[PDB]
Design a protein around this ligand. Structure first.
Ligand SMILES: *[C@@H]1O[C@H](CO)[C@@H](O)[C@H](O)[C@H]1NC(C)=O
Lengths: 50, 49
C-alpha cells in the first residue's frame, strides 16, 4: 500500500516487526540457509504481526 | 546548485535527522496509544451483555 518493494522476498508468514517499512509491512534479515536445503541468508518482507 | 549547496553547508542532514525523529516519534505515539496489550482479542460472538 505504501509503494513498490523490490529486492525483498515477500513472505506471507506473520513475524514481529524488525524494520518498519510502512502500511503495515515490515522487513527482516533472516536465515534461509537452514530453511531451503542450502540457501542464503536473505531479506524478507511480510505483514507485521499485531 | 547542488554543488553550491554542498559547499554552502551540511544543514539538511540535521533537518532530515530531526524529521526522522519526528516520524519515529509519531509511530511510537501510535504504538503507545493503540498497541497497549499485545494480544489481539476477537469480538465476543456471545453478545448478551
Ligand atoms: C503466499 O500465498 C500464495 C497464495 O496465496 C502461495 O502460493 C505461496 O506459497 C505463499 N507463500 C509465499 C509466496 O512465500
Amino acid at each position: 500500500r505504501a509503494g513498490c518493494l523490490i529486492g525483498a522476498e515477500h513472505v506471507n508468514n506473520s513475524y514481529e516487526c524488525d524494520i518498519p517499512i510502512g502500511a503495515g509491512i515490515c522487513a527482516s534479515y533472516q536465515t534461509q540457509t537452514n530453511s531451503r536445503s542450502v540457501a542464503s541468508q536473505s531479506i524478507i518482507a511480510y505483514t507485521m504481526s499485531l | 546548485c547542488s554543488n553550491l549547496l554542498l559547499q554552502y553547508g551540511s544543514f539538511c542532514t540535521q533537518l532530515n535527522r530531526a524529521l526522522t525523529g519526528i516520524a519515529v516519534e509519531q509511530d511510537k505515539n501510535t504504538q503507545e496509544v493503540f498497541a497497549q496489550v499485545k494480544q489481539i482479542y476477537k469480538t465476543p460472538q456471545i453478545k448478551d451483555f
